[PDB]
Amino acid sequence: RITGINDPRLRNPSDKFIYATVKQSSVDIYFRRQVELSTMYRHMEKHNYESAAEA
Amino acid sequence: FCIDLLIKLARTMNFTYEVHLVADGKFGTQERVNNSNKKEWNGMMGELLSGQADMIVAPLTINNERAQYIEFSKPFKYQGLTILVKK
Amino acid sequence: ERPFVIVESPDPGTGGCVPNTVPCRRQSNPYTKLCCKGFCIDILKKLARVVKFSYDLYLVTNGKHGKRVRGVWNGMIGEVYYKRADMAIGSLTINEERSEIVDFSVPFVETGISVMVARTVSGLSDKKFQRPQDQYPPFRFGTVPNGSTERNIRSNYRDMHTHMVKFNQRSVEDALTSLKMGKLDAFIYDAAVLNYMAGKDEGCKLVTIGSGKVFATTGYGIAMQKDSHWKRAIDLALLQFLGDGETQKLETVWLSGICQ
Amino acid sequence: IQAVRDNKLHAFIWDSAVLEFEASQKCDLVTTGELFFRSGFGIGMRKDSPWKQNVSLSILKSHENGFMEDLDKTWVRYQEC
Numbered sequence: 001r002i003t004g005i006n007d008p009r010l011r012n013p014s015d016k017f018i019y020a021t022v023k024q025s026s027v028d029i030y031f032r033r034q035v036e037l038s039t040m041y042r043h044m045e046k047h048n049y050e051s052a053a054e055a
Numbered sequence: 056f057c058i059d060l061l062i063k064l065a066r067t068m069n070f071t072y073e074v075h076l077v078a079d080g081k082f083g084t085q086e087r088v089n090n091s092n093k094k095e096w097n098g099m100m101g102e103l104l105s106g107q108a109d110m111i112v113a114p115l116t117i118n119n120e121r122a123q124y125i126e127f128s129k130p131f132k133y134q135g136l137t138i139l140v141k142k
Numbered sequence: 143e144r145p146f147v148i149v150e151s152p153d154p155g156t157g158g159c160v161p162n163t164v165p166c167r168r169q170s171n172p173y174t175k176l177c178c179k180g181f182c183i184d185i186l187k188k189l190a191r192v193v194k195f196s197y198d199l200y201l202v203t204n205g206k207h208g209k210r211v212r213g214v215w216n217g218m219i220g221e222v223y224y225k226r227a228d229m230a231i232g233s234l235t236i237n238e239e240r241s242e243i244v245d246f247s248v249p250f251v252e253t254g255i256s257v258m259v260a261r262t263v264s265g266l267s268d269k270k271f272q273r274p275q276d277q278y279p280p281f282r283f284g285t286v287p288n289g290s291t292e293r294n295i296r297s298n299y300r301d302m303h304t305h306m307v308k309f310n311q312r313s314v315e316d317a318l319t320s321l322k323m324g325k326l327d328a329f330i331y332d333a334a335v336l337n338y339m340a341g342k343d344e345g346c347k348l349v350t351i352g353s354g355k356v357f358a359t360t361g362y363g364i365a366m367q368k369d370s371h372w373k374r375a376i377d378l379a380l381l382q383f384l385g386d387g388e389t390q391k392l393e394t395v396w397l398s399g400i401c402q
Numbered sequence: 403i404q405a406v407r408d409n410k411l412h413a414f415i416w417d418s419a420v421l422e423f424e425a426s427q428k429c430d431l432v433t434t435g436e437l438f439f440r441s442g443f444g445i446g447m448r449k450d451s452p453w454k455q456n457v458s459l460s461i462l463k464s465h466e467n468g469f470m471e472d473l474d475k476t477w478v479r480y481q482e483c
């Protein structure tokens with residue numbers, strides 16, 4: 001159905017698919033300290049549910 | 056191929072050429088034997104450095120080490136490397 | 143250039159633009175500060191970090207690339223010729239015309255000349271572009287003027303030039319707009335930019351057969367004023383950059399494709 | 403080439419042009435995958451000799467007019483039988 005972090009849909013974000021994570025988490029720091037992956041944070045900071053299992 | 060290119064080149068710059076094959080057939084890398092730390096050249100590159108040669112016309116590579124001692128020209132055919140298996 | 147050197151407006155309020163970017167200054171000879179990032183930007187950053195030199199980024203105003211019209215050189219080539227700029231970087235091909243007065247380095251991106259079409263021609267010698275006087279008039283190949291291709295088509299098919307006065311003459315994106323509309327079906331331009339732009343598009347537009355039919359196979363280089371010793375140094379470094387697979391990484395972080 | 407064809411060895415690692423022509427030339431052999439390194443051929447001589455600059459200009463001169471492409475087509479096109 002999906003793949004790891006290799007697809008161009010994640011390398012180049014698409015308007016159809018939406019990638020979101022839990023805000024204020026360790027993954028936020030992990031994606032906030034990678035040189036090449038910085039742009040994904042640009043997507044992630046755009047819309048990520050500041051939430052929990054509700055999300 | 057290369058000799059035809061050589062003809063087409065010499066037809067333009069008033070050339071007279073004497074062509075002779077390499078001594079051993081090895082392309083050429085730096086080679087250092089014990090009691091001699093300097094990696095002396097061996098091959099047609101070493102023959103060119105020795106003084107018997109004046110120009111090399113062969114499908115040579117443009118790796119970093121070769122450009123250290125010898126000035127090259129603009130490449131005329133880009134390519135890569137590949138694997139051959141019986142099939 | 144669209145994929146290679148990208149210019150962006152500065153940070154929201156600060157002025158020092160977003161990290162992973164280099165400040166650049168467009169001159170008028172309002173020196174507003176913009177921030178530039180891209181392929182050549184990182185290439186130059188690594189080169190300066192490895193040879194210990196400092197630099198500043200300056201753009202040009204007289205034309206995009208520049209040609210020797212009326213025996214006077216405009217553009218980046220002219221700027222380097224007049225010694226108003228010591229180096230030139232970015233989308234600049236190599237050929238005999240420019241090589242007379244300006245030195246060059248070892249190429250690092252293998253370019254070419256290819257034909258973008260819709261989703262019929264298999265070479266310059268094809269009857270279509272060779273003697274276009276048939277019944278069906280296949281019209282308006284792009285070939286953005288005063289660039290790097292007009293001098294090439296100047297002595298490859300001499301009759302193609304005067305037939306080619308009317309075309310899409312706004313930009314590379316205008317050719318895509320006209321192809322999507324249908325006012326034209328022929329486009330001829332550099333291989334690298336066309337491949338990159340055909341990589342990412344809704345659906346996907348099919349270029350011609352591929353790199354197997356590129357004309358005038360050359361490579362993008364770096365211009366510099368003649369007799370500068372600096373050249374030799376960077377030349378060696380460039381080869382080392384092909385050794386560590388640096389080109390593969392710097393391309394995959396700037397090149398991709400949804401169809402290609 | 404003879405050894406690996408005789409199944410003494412299994413695969414040969416070599417430049418793309420030579421094998422790309424020979425596979426279509428002899429018989430029954432094809433290469434798999436693509437390049438993992440990219441570079442081209444060139445002319446080499448001793449440092450600081452004008453022949454170097456002049457032939458470097460002449461090579462691009464020939465490339466512009468399709469002489470090299472025409473020669474390559476002539477000498478590799480009669481293959482893939």
Ligand SMILES: *[C@@H]1O[C@H](CO)[C@@H](O[C@@H]2O[C@H](CO)[C@@H](O)[C@H](O)[C@H]2NC(C)=O)[C@H](O)[C@H]1NC(C)=O
Binds near residue numbers: 205211288289
């Ligand atoms: C190639 O040269 C032509 C001729 O100079 C350029 O076209 C000129 O563009 C200016 C822009 O304001 C006009 O004022 C002139 O009237 C144009 N001249 C002609 C003859 O059309 C053209 O812009 C150049 N190409 C590029 C890419 O700059």
Ligand SMILES: *[C@@H]1O[C@H](CO)[C@@H](O[C@@H]2O[C@H](CO)[C@@H](O)[C@H](O)[C@H]2NC(C)=O)[C@H](O)[C@H]1NC(C)=O
Binds near residue numbers: 452456
């Ligand atoms: C190299 O090619 C050039 C171009 O033909 C020539 O070199 C000199 O070029 C200038 C400018 O055209 C002439 O004024 C000189 O007379 C040329 N020198 C010679 C010796 O002819 C020449 O044909 C080639 N060789 C050298 C050494 O330059």
